[PDB]
Design an enzyme around this catalytic site. Sequence first.
Site, short mmCIF file in Angstrom:
data_model
loop_
_atom_site.label_atom_id
_atom_site.label_comp_id
_atom_site.label_asym_id
_atom_site.label_seq_id
_atom_site.Cartn_x
_atom_site.Cartn_y
_atom_site.Cartn_z
N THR A 8 3.93 -1.32 3.73
CA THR A 8 4.69 -1.56 4.95
C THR A 8 4.14 -2.83 5.58
O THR A 8 2.95 -3.12 5.44
CB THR A 8 4.54 -0.37 5.91
OG1 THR A 8 3.14 -0.04 6.04
CG2 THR A 8 5.28 0.84 5.42
N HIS A 22 0.37 9.07 0.32
CA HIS A 22 -0.66 8.04 0.42
C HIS A 22 -1.76 8.50 1.38
O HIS A 22 -1.49 8.70 2.57
CB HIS A 22 -0.06 6.75 1.00
CG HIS A 22 0.85 6.09 0.05
ND1 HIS A 22 1.79 5.14 0.39
CD2 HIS A 22 0.96 6.27 -1.29
CE1 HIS A 22 2.44 4.78 -0.71
NE2 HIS A 22 1.95 5.41 -1.76
N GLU A 63 7.31 5.18 -4.26
CA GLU A 63 7.14 3.75 -4.20
C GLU A 63 6.69 3.24 -5.56
O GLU A 63 7.38 2.43 -6.20
CB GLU A 63 6.14 3.40 -3.09
CG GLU A 63 6.75 3.72 -1.71
CD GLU A 63 6.16 2.98 -0.56
OE1 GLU A 63 4.91 2.90 -0.50
OE2 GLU A 63 6.96 2.45 0.23
#
Length: 257
Positions: free
Chosen positions: A196, A116, A103
């Site tokens: 998200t 993450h 990302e």
Amino acid sequence: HWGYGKHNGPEHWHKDFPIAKGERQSPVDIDTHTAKYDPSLKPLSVSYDQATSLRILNNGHAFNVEFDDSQDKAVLKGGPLDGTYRLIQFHFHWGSLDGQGSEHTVDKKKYAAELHLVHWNTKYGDFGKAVQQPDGLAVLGIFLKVGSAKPGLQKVVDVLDSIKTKGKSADFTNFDPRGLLPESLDYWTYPGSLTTPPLLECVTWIVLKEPISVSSEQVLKFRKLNFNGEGEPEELMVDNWRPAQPLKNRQIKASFK
Ligand SMILES: [Zn+2]
């Protein structure tokens, strides 16, 4: 519902989640020459000796390895942070091929995957309250490149066939997340968001400079997961990453020169 297809992927998310076009969205490209070395930044304190993993879940967008966050047993402090942040879960983002998946990017380089480790600020009492605050979460981001195997990842890899499809979970106790860390805790940091939906602007990002190495075989097992539920048309869980968002009025700081 939102996802990572042509019809429901990141470029569509703003319709249901207008904060997608906000002032502190994640991820971002880390321009290493522009990041300011900040001698005031403290070493990161990662205290995972008492971590209690409980379960692994395929949530239809990733898999989450969940922890007992009912006490201060696995906490992040120091670095750019004030106070104490408890580990709630970790997950990854990855690609259909090794040339994409991360990302965050580094001078526009994409890694094969990104880990993450998500922590919430204990001063807000629970995760759901923390995500409503600008300093509610600290996410430790770790890049994955493909090369040698990561021995500490293999227990994760070898449970994925039991959670192939959306909504499946499995017991996942006694997993030690220390085995996913690189040697160095040098980092970049900047204020951002969850990557998200609901894309809340509640995250202090801490992105480690040093990637971990995983094997091609390890990452290939990630790519056998499914976004779909049991029995549904198979759509492999690949390319579950949001691309870099505009930096806007933000500074990325480095803990190191
Ligand atoms: Zn993530």
